[PDB]
Symmetry: none
Subunit: 477 residues, 4 copies
């Protein structure tokens, strides 16, 4: 059965259809039609006939998409413009006759709660987080732990209104909007660093925008203060994406104000926003301790991945990681990437046994993996591509999620792990010592294990050979 | 659960591990190890001990790969070489302690029986069929009517100017001339080949872009030249062809080891199709919904377009899988769909047929790529287009996912013109539909498919 | 003007046509036609008029290709099969007049001498070398230094003869291998002392068996270095297949496979008797030998210079950048444990790094790689050629590790290090004047480079500063830490 | 040696550095904003004064080792106006080791015409349109002597302000600009139209947006007002300005694209312009060729390239000889006009370029070189077809690439390709005295070639190569008979 969320906003009407798969949800259609509803709104604070007719025609099309979707599974909501129209009930009234179902105007705060609920369902990392959505109407800031909102503030700052207001681009023109936006940030520095966060995550177009310029210029996806300073000092350089660009400097001035005010170290892009909030709310899902686990679990059902074999390889790889962790100085996100790889590593077998690593990497590049950044997906995919056969460093280093040396190391851990869990018995997995000395791995097998496992011996000899072609010394006794 | 078939042959030991998932089985490993058992015979019909050592060493590896498989789901068998050895009992004895389980020596007829069961459970096409292994068999629907072992084999004939070819050919036609009689009586709708040799030939068929025409024209790719076993196997078959008056040969999707697996288990196409839907969580009501529309469309245009019942079933198959790309992701679903179909093993469809499903699926929407429709051998180019059209339009009018919301339509074909008639007023009441149908119209026309809809 | 070389061989007639461009050679046509002349030999060693007909007909084509080239600039040679056939004098005379020129039967020794000349003009590395060429009927071993042979031998063993004696019954077992190797050691043994006396710094090989090895190793993902270990692994593989007709080795083509076991056996026997540590594939052979003699020390440098001439590369800029690169290498060669091979490859990159400019400035790295990838570069192996190309592809802009690492020639970490030196070296030659290159020190601390500039040099050059800053960013996106003040 | 050219604009400073025929080494644009130092009384402020100076010290570090004799600097736009400008120009002159001169807009337009005149192919009798962001230059001329010259007041940036005070491509704000610009050049209009031109070429941003839009959308390369208004209609249908998108348009382009789209179609109408190719040079190129003190471009290009890649020139003429003769014998039957004769000869002069890389896959190398080389006197479309002819000079034909070009119709790309293969083959002996006498006759898709009596029988390798060439053509349905 189908679920739908419609967001009637300022410039565009957004409709996201979606479908229930096992205990999951996948996008079916995701649609945006440019109504220009805030443009038809005059100095009497009412909305011109032309804009309400534009908006209504759009919804006549959306209405065609909702037929025999039970309205229990639909939620339509509206935002700033329809919040502040003196007209609004005239539009909403016909809107609800066109669609077969209610329109709910929502407070700027209920938009924030919804947005949070949307990143919370779609974002990996720590439960304690601080969400930043810089929109044109309101720039919300919310703190929370695992789907409970501790603080929730919808503050009135636009990328449009900090734009027109303070830009008719100086190094000091940001300066105005900066302190301007900092005045609103001045009271809540108290309560936002009160509850704090261990991870910071952005949600909307200006955030999305910055993500895409970093991607474009060759940086990773970590938004740091020093990277926005490449811009601000190059942002009086020009001095005065197409649509994104126009509204960019104000949003950028707001972000460079928020990083400095709150001493946010790092921001990365949420995988969720309002429309996901609405449609996850309708799912009635117990909220998970770790989102990535739900994702992996659902993919495993969908593609009938053998879970016991999956779990067995994760255990071996986790054990190997822990034993080389100090010598290789691996951090924890690498461990979760490695395990996540192991949970998915046989998905290529869904398609066919022969070229399964090719199939694995195809599926993982292209699957929607909530809880995983785009950069992390590619890393997982290329790890899966290199799970066996001659190492292909060319395709391995097609990732930017972890440092290259570390990509190689997680590759090595995954390849070995698959080999020593390969018998598909939880009692056939031997006791082993793994010791790393710089680029050397030494694996100590149970005495007599090799001479007693002639297929194991063959496979480890081959693996040693392959790692050596790529100058990874492997010694297994 | 996981099942294994092992075939102890003369030259090689073969293994097949298979997993039973949803409505069928999928291959896990398919392994061949060269033990050269036959080479260790001394003319006293005894096996060298070095040969026994090789075979036991190969089994030691197989046996490691088979732990967590229970003996009742394994079948190990042994072909002619261990049939003729006074030694055999000694090898088989250590082998059964190495493996977890018994080794069953089997007669050639029984091997031909099991082989045939293997082609039966894995091969699309009709029921009655004539199998050729360079051992020939006829049967209908998993029941072997006739059976054979003839006086030719792979290596046997070898020991290319037209002399040396027809030195094999007519001497092969000699071998099969007296036995070719009782065959035509039993009859065959479909002629198939199971041996690897046949696969020498299928690789060329879908490599250049099985008939006696292409056989002689291949035999003349040989004559003009002036691989170990190939020229023998060729001369036999094109002799097996003429003397049996056989129209065309396809390749079976199974052999001995498939026979052993299915014999342990409690329309091939239908099984595959539903198997795939299960595995990739395709919405089966929607697939059926699209198929009834497309088949209904098909029926209305098939008289004008001269369409074969065979084309009908390719079209319906395409509709059964058309949403498989969505199991990956919605954005570029047509391309994931072509990817999955291209790489799945699909029992009941030839390589040309699978290649045609893929491109039908890739072109189920968006700007049409005619070249893509064209690189495929299951159907003429024009037919691939005709069925692509029906599939794209069937998908549009079923996009609601509800049986009673798909409109009553009539479809008329005048050469390349399709004329779709919707219920009166339908277009008026469906603004998004209007929009989709105009965009499809625009797309069909970029590629010279003229489409009126009323 | 044109030069041409005909090799009338046992299985094939080979032609090479060639042109003197700049100060080196450029190949125009390279032609092999199978006449299978030895196939028309008989038990009495006379050539079937069938075979002899195929031969003349080929030479009739070689002839038309040959017209309007002076006989001064042509050499036609016949080898083992035509020095066998009693019949042979008859094929020559007609062939000699089907072509416009003489057909010279050569001894196995003159065959050896031209082979060594072929390799010495095309092969980089230590110029004091051992050359092995295992042919059908004979095996040349020549010992030499930089075009001067110090010892030379043509011995009666070869893949075709050895397949017949020791692989009598078509079995690939340890029995027949042991015999084949034992006989070859006994052929070779008497000349071993003279070969070791003159010694060699590098062993390089030449014919089908060596080529089969390059193609096998390439296919299986190994480097291009032939070692005893790899030969033993192939041998155990051959023994596993057990019958010549069942030989299957990944990388081993059909027509190499027929003569592969016997050659493999001879080469292992050669590898053992002389204790060869490593054998690589020579740049050239008999037909190169024929050509370089009609033309009348460091192969790499001749190649680099000739390419610079052909593509109008600025040679002063090239040397400038190479000097900066070579000196960066030395300051860091310690901490990064870098060998002499790397230094040469780094410098060679520097000599060619600007060759993409000869196409156009916008995409010049992309063009440089295309040119280097596809150019013939005598003195460089295909693995080295591909490395150079990829250092050039990455000489500027955001580092692309994916393209950097499709390279087999150095170890992966060394490919990066060399790349980093090439990028910096280029940056500090950017103004194209030897006087304008600062005094610098570069210390390497594991993955981090520290570069110290003359006092306030950064403050004085707002461009150099700007670029350097960009290069430290580029390096940082790949996690190469670079400090410059 | 190396030459430099610096252009001091109100918006940006522009460098062009070149090695000597000549080739670009660096092409630089720095952002200055000298228009924002000009106040109400029209003197230049000391904020931007330092900015352009800070920019000039970067250009300065680049231009050492270039003697000032081989440098040329000019200042335009904002620098004329400002009464303060002399102050700037003075310290700028100290920063660079060389003089800066202030040039007018009409001298600006002469150096512009000089730029296209030395670089651009096609009829030496031309109309040049260049739309700055503020000033629009239009110049009639015949072959490096200019018949007429104009610099008007309209530009992308200006028309984005005055006649575009929002983001609505609705015809009301659009056609006010298509008028107020059309009346701007309506006074000068008549003197251009009677001076006349055989060809119209353009050189500003607006014109590069169209060349790019056209190669991306697969159209042929002549810009028409009909083509201009498929983009007007896929502009108009785009509602607001920020929402604008078409195939082949880029970041900085669409920024001011619509305001220039109006100006070009206004120039297209009032002047009644039939089509437009993209000019090969401009102001900075003018400056550069003024320092070189140097007949027809293409032949100058072909020589230069043949020298860089050491192409055997004799063999190149020898092949172009045969292909010329083959062209003339099929010329009437096949609808072959001189434009596409030159293209055949140009392909021949270069046909051996890939051999400068390596002989094995030379055709593939020749296409790569020609595809990426800068070839003054050939449009992008013509270059692209030259590449594919060279790719297909031998070896099984590939039609897709032969039909991948904007230059000459998919039909003729083949007929040309056919004649090149034939000319190469019979020139293949590298000697004048060995080319055989030949007749070549076409009838629809049949070529029939008569070699001397007994030639074939007595050229087995020829006979073999010819046979293989008959098969390759037939594969692609090109019937060929030869006797
Ligand atoms: Cl794979
Ligand atoms: Cl990486
Ligand atoms: Cl077997
Ligand atoms: Cl029948
Ligand atoms: Cl030595
Ligand atoms: Cl290796
Ligand atoms: Cl050595
Ligand atoms: Cl003038």
């Amino acid at each position: 059965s189908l679920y739908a969320a419609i967001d009637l906003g300022s410039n565009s009407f957004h409709m996201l259809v979606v479908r229930e798969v096992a205990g999951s949800i996948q996008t079916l259609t995701r649609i945006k039609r440019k109504v220009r509803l805030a443009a038809g709104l005059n100095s009497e604070n009412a909305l011109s006939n032309e804009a309400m007719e534009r908006g209504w025609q759009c919804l006549r099309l959306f209405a065609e998409r909702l037929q025999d979707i039970p309205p229990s599974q639909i939620r339509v909501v509206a935002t700033a413009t329809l919040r502040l129209a003196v007209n609004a009930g005239d539009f909403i009234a016909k809107a609800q006759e066109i669609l077969g179902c209610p329109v709910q105007v929502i407070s700027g705060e209920e938009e924030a709660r919804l947005i949070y609920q949307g990143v919370a369902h779609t974002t990996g990392g720590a439960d304690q987080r601080l969400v930043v959505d810089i929109g044109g109407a309101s720039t919300e800031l919310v703190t929370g732990t695992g789907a409970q909102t501790t603080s929730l503030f919808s503050l009135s700052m636009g990328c449009v209104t900090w734009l027109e207001r303070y830009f008719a681009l100086g190094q000091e023109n940001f300066d105005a909007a900066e302190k301007a936006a900092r005045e609103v940030l001045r009271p809540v520095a108290d309560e936002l660093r009160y509850h704090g966060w261990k991870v910071c995550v952005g949600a909307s177009g200006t955030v999305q925008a910055l993500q895409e310029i970093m991607m474009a210029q060759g940086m990773d996806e970590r938004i740091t203060l020093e990277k926005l300073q490449q811009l601000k000092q190059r942002a009086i350089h020009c001095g005065r994406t197409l649509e994104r660009a126009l509204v960019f400097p104000s949003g950028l001035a707001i972000l460079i104000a928020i990083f400095t005010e709150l001493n946010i170290q790092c921001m990365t892009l949420a995988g969720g926003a309002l429309r996901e909030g609405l449609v996850y709310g309708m799912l009635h899902l117990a909220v998970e301790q770790d989102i990535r686990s739900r994702t992996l679990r659902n993919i495993q059902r969908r593609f009938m991945i053998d879970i016991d074999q999956a779990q067995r390889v994760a255990k071996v790889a986790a054990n190997f990681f822990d034993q080389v962790e100090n010598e290789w100085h691996l951090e924890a996100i690498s461990r979760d990437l490695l395990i996540s790889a192991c949970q998915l590593h046989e998905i290529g077998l869904s398609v066919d046994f022969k070229q399964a690593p090719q199939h694995a990497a195809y599926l993982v590049r292209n699957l929607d993996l909530p809880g995983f950044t785009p950069a992390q997906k590619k890393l997982l995919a290329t790890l899966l591509l290199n799970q066996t056969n001659p190492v292909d460093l060319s395709s391995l280093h097609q990732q930017n999620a972890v440092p290259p040396r570390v990509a190689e190391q997680l590759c090595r851990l995954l390849r070995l792990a698959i080999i020593f869990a390969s018998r598909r018995r939880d009692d056939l997995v031997p006791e082993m010592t793994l010791q790393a000395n710089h680029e050397l791995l030494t694996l100590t097998l149970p005495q007599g294990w090799l001479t007693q496992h002639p297929l194991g011996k063959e496979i480890i000899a081959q693996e040693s050979q392959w790692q050596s072609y790529v100058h990874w010394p492997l010694e297994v006794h």
